[PDB]
């Protein structure tokens, strides 16, 4: 029984699974987890990059000494839940503390052969269609004292985001309550009398200062400024559909559940928080935090 890195297999190409799984709590066992050095995140990042490359493969043609853009059937449905599964000689430990911060000892640890159905959703700033936290909202970071270290936020009440083509719609009441919850959670870690400020991303490139995602085969970039303009009838976010063009090859509506956020802290008596992150390893890490791989 020791920590190890190995290639998990996948299940729903991937192998069948779950006509009847089995979770099993290991009694009297406490296990140390570290969501920030979990090689499952690296494996899933690589798998998602390969998934996108393979989805782009049928849009090229190898005619002569080059690859040319070609047919491309647009509606390429990507997100179906996948499960990562330990191979022979290994086992996946799963934390069950509903408020686990990701870095520390879990007192209620079960053992599994496969993870839950994880939806590979590529999105920025907002985490959509993910898992929810029981009871309380959770905030997780390697080092809260260290700004520019991404802050992963898991809610307990999801927020419906209904987008059409081109804008998105969020209820002001639900989002107001969500922001209040996040503000109190941040006050817990940064100071009680400290005031929380939500402001727009502090970058410049319009590709990262927006909430971007895939809405029915087309990629949307939405100005999310109306969500981060607060200090502690219906919000319509303006959006633009951008076409992905691969540089080196020669020549509508959807509803989602907002289940998480990615924030970055500034760096007085207050604290400014801005939507950040961008790296998708934090997107996958927001779901693989309560797992680890061990060798028996």
């Amino acid at each position: 029984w020791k920590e190890a890195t190995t290639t998990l297999f996948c299940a729903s190409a991937c192998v069948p699974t779950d006509p009847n799984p089995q979770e099993v709590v290991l009694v009297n066992v406490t296990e140390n987890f570290n969501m920030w050095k979990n090689d499952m995140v690296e494996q899933m990042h690589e798998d998602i990059i390969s998934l996108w490359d393979q989805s782009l493969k049928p849009c090229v043609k190898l005619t002569g000494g080059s690859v040319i853009t070609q047919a491309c059937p647009k509606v390429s449905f990507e997100p179906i839940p996948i499960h990562y599964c330990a191979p022979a000689g290994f086992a996946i430990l799963k934390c069950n503390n509903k408020t686990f911060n990701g870095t520390g000892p879990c007192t209620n640890v079960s053992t599994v052969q496969c993870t839950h159905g994880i939806r590979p959703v590529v999105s920025t700033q907002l985490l959509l269609n993910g898992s929810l936290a029981e009871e309380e909202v959770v905030i997780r970071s390697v080092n809260f004292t260290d700004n520019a270290k991404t802050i992963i936020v898991q809610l307990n009440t999801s927020v419906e985001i209904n987008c059409t083509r081109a804008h998105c719609n969020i209820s002001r009441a639900k989002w107001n309550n969500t922001l209040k919850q996040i503000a109190s959670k941040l006050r817990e870690q940064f100071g009680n009398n400290k005031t929380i400020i939500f402001k727009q991303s502090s970058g410049g490139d319009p590709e990262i200062v927006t909430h971007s995602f895939n809405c029915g085969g087309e990629f949307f970039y939405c100005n999310s400024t109306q969500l981060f303009n607060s200090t502690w009838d219906t919000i319509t976010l303006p959006c633009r559909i951008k076409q992905i063009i691969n540089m080196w090859q020669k020549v509508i509506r959807c509803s989602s559940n907002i289940t998480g956020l990615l924030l970055t802290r500034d760096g007085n008596e207050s604290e400014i928080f801005r939507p950040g992150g961008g790296d998708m390893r934090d997107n996958w890490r927001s779901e693989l935090y309560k797992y680890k791989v061990v060798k028996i």
Partner: nanobody
Amino acid sequence: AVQLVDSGGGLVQAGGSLRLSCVVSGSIFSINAMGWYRQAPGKQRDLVARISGDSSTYYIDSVKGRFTISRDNAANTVYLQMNSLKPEDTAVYYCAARRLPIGDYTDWGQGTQVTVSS
């Protein structure tokens, strides 16, 4: 996978010009956006410029008017022409490429050192 090679950096004087090159190799037909970051010892990263598949570009305000990012298809290269160079441009520059449809970059080079004196 993808391999990026940065080159071009060196010593010049204030008001001189440089041309950084990022050569691209491997499974490159999934890149939809490349760019140049720069970092000086003791400071945070800085996305200075980026080009996308549709040839649209972005530059930070500090380099708007002095820097130009462009693409050489016949050479699989991305060029960053730096003009009116100022001492505030001294850093290690890395070229980066994105192989996911959105998000931050996925592939990075080894970096090249740009220094300028006054």
